[PDB]
Design a protein around this nucleic acid. Sequence first.
DNA 1: CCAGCGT
DNA 2: GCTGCGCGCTGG
DNA 3: GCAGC
Length: 140
Amino acid sequence: WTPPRSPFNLVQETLFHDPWKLLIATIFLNRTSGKMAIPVLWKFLEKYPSAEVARTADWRDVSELLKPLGLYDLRAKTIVKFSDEYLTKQWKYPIELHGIGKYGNDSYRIFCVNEWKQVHPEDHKLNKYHDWLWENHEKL
DNA sequence: CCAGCGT
DNA sequence: GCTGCGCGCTGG
DNA sequence: GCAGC
Ligand SMILES: [Mg+2]
């Protein structure tokens, strides 16, 4: 499964090979514009390239890197706990994990596995992508 | 300047 | 069902 | 957007 590139340029389109990075990106986008969140994501991923590193991090150090995005202590704590669970808990879908809800889960189900036809997003940008897929999947 | 917004 | 979390961006 | 409430 290779999810197609869209005229909406969702960041999930480039991250889908690594479900942890795609999910981290969803967290970066919690009430935060892509214009600001996505450039900081690359800085975060340079420093915390995997769940294995992030799960050992001190949330206070993560929070310093996230300050300009707001929600910095909440999100730092989320990222460390999510990362721990991703690696250590049994799960089938990432909504079972702390810090991912329907938006992250829907993103995972469209981008990381081939369940896009079963997903009904509430997030507007994800809905635009999903409508576009229905409209275009034959052509693709 | 500043009240409302952002996958 | 509603709240706390939080910054900088947006643009009239 | 998400968890907590
Ligand atoms: Mg969850």
